[PDB]
Enzyme design. Structure first.
Site, PDB file in Angstrom:
ATOM      1  N   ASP A 178       0.841  -1.361  -0.094  1.00  0.00           N
ATOM      2  CA  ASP A 178      -0.441  -0.160   0.281  1.00  0.00           C
ATOM      3  C   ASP A 178       0.853   1.199   0.106  1.00  0.00           C
ATOM      4  O   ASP A 178       0.244   2.779   0.506  1.00  0.00           O
ATOM      5  CB  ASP A 178      -0.764   0.077   1.274  1.00  0.00           C
ATOM      6  CG  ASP A 178      -2.419   1.020   1.225  1.00  0.00           C
ATOM      7  OD1 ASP A 178      -2.315   1.114   0.179  1.00  0.00           O
ATOM      8  OD2 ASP A 178      -2.306   1.245   1.818  1.00  0.00           O
TER       9      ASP A 178
ATOM     10  N   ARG B 111      -0.277   9.190   1.140  1.00  0.00           N
ATOM     11  CA  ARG B 111      -1.266   9.119   2.849  1.00  0.00           C
ATOM     12  C   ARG B 111      -0.113   7.893   3.553  1.00  0.00           C
ATOM     13  O   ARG B 111      -0.524   8.455   4.952  1.00  0.00           O
ATOM     14  CB  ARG B 111      -2.622   8.980   1.597  1.00  0.00           C
ATOM     15  CG  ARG B 111      -2.724   6.971   2.077  1.00  0.00           C
ATOM     16  CD  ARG B 111      -3.451   7.232   2.055  1.00  0.00           C
ATOM     17  NE  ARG B 111      -4.328   6.584   0.480  1.00  0.00           N
ATOM     18  CZ  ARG B 111      -3.902   5.760  -0.527  1.00  0.00           C
ATOM     19  NH1 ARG B 111      -3.394   4.208  -0.092  1.00  0.00           N
ATOM     20  NH2 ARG B 111      -4.258   6.006  -1.684  1.00  0.00           N
ATOM     21  N   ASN B 112       0.266   7.344   3.085  1.00  0.00           N
ATOM     22  CA  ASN B 112       0.633   6.159   4.292  1.00  0.00           C
ATOM     23  C   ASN B 112       2.548   6.615   4.385  1.00  0.00           C
ATOM     24  O   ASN B 112       3.211   5.353   4.821  1.00  0.00           O
ATOM     25  CB  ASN B 112       0.788   4.967   3.449  1.00  0.00           C
ATOM     26  CG  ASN B 112      -0.253   4.032   3.635  1.00  0.00           C
ATOM     27  OD1 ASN B 112      -1.084   4.492   5.134  1.00  0.00           O
ATOM     28  ND2 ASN B 112      -1.231   3.594   2.592  1.00  0.00           N
TER      29      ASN B 112
ATOM     30  N   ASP C 200       1.768   3.103   7.472  1.00  0.00           N
ATOM     31  CA  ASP C 200       1.163   2.295   6.969  1.00  0.00           C
ATOM     32  C   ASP C 200       0.086   1.965   7.951  1.00  0.00           C
ATOM     33  O   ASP C 200      -0.365   1.231   8.971  1.00  0.00           O
ATOM     34  CB  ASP C 200       1.481   0.710   6.919  1.00  0.00           C
ATOM     35  CG  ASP C 200       0.105  -0.102   6.067  1.00  0.00           C
ATOM     36  OD1 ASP C 200      -0.770   0.299   6.392  1.00  0.00           O
ATOM     37  OD2 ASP C 200       0.245  -0.965   5.310  1.00  0.00           O
TER      38      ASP C 200
HETATM   39  C1  MUH Z   1       0.432   4.801  16.232  1.00  0.00           C
HETATM   40  C2  MUH Z   1       1.196   3.816  14.555  1.00  0.00           C
HETATM   41  C3  MUH Z   1       1.171   3.087  15.526  1.00  0.00           C
HETATM   42  C4  MUH Z   1       1.895   1.812  14.358  1.00  0.00           C
HETATM   43  C5  MUH Z   1       2.565   1.847  13.179  1.00  0.00           C
HETATM   44  N1  MUH Z   1       2.327   1.083  12.372  1.00  0.00           N
HETATM   45  C6  MUH Z   1       2.717   1.771  10.673  1.00  0.00           C
HETATM   46  O1  MUH Z   1       3.040   2.730   9.804  1.00  0.00           O
HETATM   47  C7  MUH Z   1       3.291   0.266   9.729  1.00  0.00           C
HETATM   48  C8  MUH Z   1       2.663  -1.172  10.379  1.00  0.00           C
HETATM   49  C9  MUH Z   1       3.113  -2.063   9.530  1.00  0.00           C
HETATM   50  C10 MUH Z   1       3.981  -2.241   8.534  1.00  0.00           C
HETATM   51  C11 MUH Z   1       4.855  -0.760   8.217  1.00  0.00           C
HETATM   52  C12 MUH Z   1       6.149  -0.552   7.468  1.00  0.00           C
HETATM   53  F1  MUH Z   1       6.619  -1.351   6.682  1.00  0.00           F
HETATM   54  F2  MUH Z   1       5.768   0.054   5.842  1.00  0.00           F
HETATM   55  F3  MUH Z   1       7.184   0.474   7.779  1.00  0.00           F
HETATM   56  C13 MUH Z   1       4.261   0.142   8.966  1.00  0.00           C
HETATM   57  C14 MUH Z   1       1.492   3.604  12.993  1.00  0.00           C
HETATM   58  C15 MUH Z   1       1.160   4.506  14.284  1.00  0.00           C
HETATM   59  N2  MUH Z   1       1.219   5.568  13.136  1.00  0.00           N
HETATM   60  C16 MUH Z   1       0.361   6.790  13.228  1.00  0.00           C
HETATM   61  N3  MUH Z   1      -1.162   5.624  12.708  1.00  0.00           N
HETATM   62  C17 MUH Z   1      -2.026   6.705  12.962  1.00  0.00           C
HETATM   63  C18 MUH Z   1      -2.280   7.659  12.685  1.00  0.00           C
HETATM   64  C19 MUH Z   1      -1.365   8.183  12.430  1.00  0.00           C
HETATM   65  C20 MUH Z   1       0.167   8.012  13.538  1.00  0.00           C
HETATM   66  C21 MUH Z   1       1.132   8.742  13.995  1.00  0.00           C
HETATM   67  C22 MUH Z   1       1.150  10.226  13.435  1.00  0.00           C
HETATM   68  C23 MUH Z   1       2.036  11.040  13.653  1.00  0.00           C
HETATM   69  N4  MUH Z   1       3.755  10.358  13.730  1.00  0.00           N
HETATM   70  C24 MUH Z   1       3.706   9.162  14.096  1.00  0.00           C
HETATM   71  N5  MUH Z   1       2.817   8.503  14.066  1.00  0.00           N
END
Ligand code: MUH
Length: 255
Positions: free
Chosen positions: A114, A118-119, A132
């Site tokens: 994905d 956005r991601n 993600d």
């Molecule tokens: C809170 C939180 C927990 C976990 C992840 N995980 C991922 O992404 C992710 C999952 C599986 C695989 C990957 C990959 F390989 F691509 F790296 C990444 C993102 C966010 N963060 C999050 N979630 C929802 C809304 C906003 C935020 C957010 C805002 C600001 N800073 C950090 N996070």
């Protein structure tokens, strides 16, 4: 369920079923990803919620759009004769960042499935970071390779197809791809060789890199390393590749 915190400065996702397998999944996943400056950084899980370093600049999609200075603050734009608070070199850097992180991931047999502005997160020092956030939950059709759309085939080659779309979003400063085209209108024209058009403010060399990503034959698309290298070559030259100056009939790719 996501909350800011000092767990250092970070962001935590509070989770209390299906969500239990996804949670037991996502963590298992983030653990295996390791650590690299172009992918999210998970600080850990706890039992009392998954936390990763916080990104003070939000997702790249929103970032690119706030960059649309002619919309956000025309006095400044016009005065400075510029269309975005972001420059060609900065745009290419975000692009090089994602290609760099994706190369670190693909080498680990990690298929993203994905990739899209956005991601992607824009973190400390403006370092783009692969993330993600999740998918009604319809499929991201506008970003899917033809083979993902028809046979649910997902690979590094299809991650590259999405990447090419993301690059397009970058150059477009966050424009929706296939603006004003139906999701179904794609299942039809895509297999017929239809592809996004060369953005007006885009140098042919960037557009070429985009075309390479969307080739019908999965094995003919470049690797994420060939993309990092080519982008690096552009960042390296003096030539400007993404036009961001203002001109009489200038207009933004639609949203
Ligand atoms: C809170 C939180 C927990 C976990 C992840 N995980 C991922 O992404 C992710 C999952 C599986 C695989 C990957 C990959 F390989 F691509 F790296 C990444 C993102 C966010 N963060 C999050 N979630 C929802 C809304 C906003 C935020 C957010 C805002 C600001 N800073 C950090 N996070």
């Amino acid at each position: 369920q996501v909350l800011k915190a000092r767990i250092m400065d970070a962001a935590i996702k509070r989770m209390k079923k299906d969500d239990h397998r996804d949670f037991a999944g996502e963590l298992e996943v983030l653990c295996k990803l390791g650590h690299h400056p172009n992918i999210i950084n998970l600080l850990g899980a706890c039992e009392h919620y998954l936390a990763i370093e916080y990104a003070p600049h939000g997702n790249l999609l929103d970032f690119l759009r706030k960059s649309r200075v002619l919309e956000t603050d025309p006095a400044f734009a016009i005065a400075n004769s510029t269309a975005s608070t972001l420059s060609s070199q900065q745009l290419l850097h975000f692009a090089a960042d994602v290609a760099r992180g994706m190369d670190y991931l693909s080498q680990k047999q990690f298929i993203h499935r994905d990739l899209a502005a956005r991601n992607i997160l824009v973190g400390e020092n403006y370092v783009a970071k692969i993330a993600d956030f999740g998918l009604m939950g319809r499929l991201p059709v506008r970003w899917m390779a033809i083979e993902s759309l028809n046979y649910s085939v997902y690979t590094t080659n299809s991650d590259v197809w999405s990447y090419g779309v993301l690059l397009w979003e970058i150059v477009s400063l966050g424009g929706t791809p296939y603006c004003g085209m139906t999701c179904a209108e794609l299942y039809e024209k895509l297999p017929q060789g239809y592809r996004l058009e060369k953005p007006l403010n885009c140098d042919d060399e960037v557009y070429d890199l985009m075309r390479q990503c969307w080739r019908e034959k999965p094995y003919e698309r470049p690797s994420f390393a060939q993309i990092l290298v080519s982008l690096n070559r552009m960042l390296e030259e003096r030539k400007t590749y993404v036009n961001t100056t203002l001109y009489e009939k200038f207009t933004y790719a639609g949203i």
